[PDB]
Each structure stands twice: as C-alpha cells, then as structure tokens.
C-alpha cells in the first residue's frame, strides 16, 4: 500500500532531525520509502518571526495495517523529537502525520485518514503534489484541481 506521510519540524536547524526521521521511516518493518519531496520552507504565523517550519512529503510503500503504521510514526516522533518546555501542551519538534493510506478512508478513535485538515494546508499539498501530481483523493477530488482552484501560495524550498 502507498502511504503518504507529512514531515514537519519547527527546529531552527531541522535538516539533521528531518534526515534522521527519514532514515527511521525507511527502516519501519514491512515498509520502504518510494520517494521524498523537496524540503520546503513554511513561513510562520505571527508577526514576531518564529523559526521557519520545514515541510516535506514521503511516499512509503508498506504492508502494515494503517494502525500499525501509526504505531511506528508515533514511536519515531517520541524517539526523534520532543515537546517544548515552554508549552508542555504544545507542538512537538518533529511531526510525522499520515496524510493518506492507499485509497482508504479511516475514521477510528485513534486515526482519521485522509488527514482531516490537509486540503486546507498548502504546506501539505504542495510537497505532496511534487511527488504525486496525479493523485486523486478517496472522495474523488483531484489534488491538481484543489491546488488550481484554491490557489495556495507556493512554498519556497528550504
């Protein structure tokens, strides 16, 4: 099954982190990376100028069940990232989110696929479009059409 995973990091120097996470993803059992998008720079929300967020997309071929894949992405988040002291309730330093899992729709307590908000997020859609320009969502909506009609700003490369 082809799973599409979003990677993100709010670290000032995220490349090490992101590259280590990619290594970890490829080593998930019963799985291997097909391709990885370019790394993109996602500007912060807030006038102050937080660190730029690095965003990318990974296509992962896997024979795991979706919840088994989630076990691994959660594990990698725990092993390769952390929550920040300033906001123990806040974001993690390394994000791995399952965006799509084959052509499945999943609505369980633990997992919602497609990612509930991805169609509203240029930083998810643009990297995805780089690696899967012909992608069609389970509901029939074409990735190309969403980007073409909604006109999200392109992201600069990291």
Domain count, the chain: 1
Rounded Cα gap, residues 26 and 33, in angstroms: 5
Domain that residue 21 falls in: 1-158
The three-state (H, E, C) secondary structure of 61-106, written as one string:
EECCCHHHHHHHHHHHHHHHCCECHHHCCCCECEEEEEEEECCCCE
Q: For residue 63, what are its two tokens?
A: 């024979």
92 is catalytic: yes
Say if residues 32 and 60 touch (Cβ distance below 8 Å). yes
Q: For residue 16, what are its two tokens?
A: 């090490």
Beta-carbon contacts of 20 under 8 Å, excluding residues fewer than 6 positions away, are 80
In the set 75, 82, 144, 150, the catalytic residue is: 82
95 is catalytic: yes
CATH, residue 100: 3.30.70.560
Q: For residue 23, what are its two tokens?
A: 């290594």
82 is catalytic: yes
Q: For residue 88, what are its two tokens?
A: 């123990």
Pick the closest to residue 124 from 45, 27, 7, 9 (CA basis). 7
């Amino acid at each position: 099954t082809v799973a599409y995973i979003a990677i993100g990091s709010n670290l000032a120097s995220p490349l090490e982190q992101v590259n280590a996470a990619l290594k970890a993803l490829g080593d998930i059992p019963e799985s291997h990376i097909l391709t990885v998008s370019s790394f993109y720079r996602t500007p912060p929300l807030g006038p102050q100028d937080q660190p730029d967020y690095l965003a990318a997309a990974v296509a992962l071929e896997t024979s795991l069940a979706p919840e088994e894949l989630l076990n691994h992405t959660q594990r990698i988040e725990l092993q390769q990232g952390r929550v920040r002291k300033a906001e123990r309730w806040g974001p993690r330093t390394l994000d791995l989110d399952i965006m799509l899992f084959g052509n499945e729709v999943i609505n369980t307590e633990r997992l919602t696929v497609p990612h509930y908000d991805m169609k509203n997020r240029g930083f998810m859609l643009w990297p995805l479009f780089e690696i899967a320009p012909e992608l069609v969502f389970p509901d029939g909506e074409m990735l190309r059409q969403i980007l073409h009609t909604r006109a999200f700003d392109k992201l600069n490369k990291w």
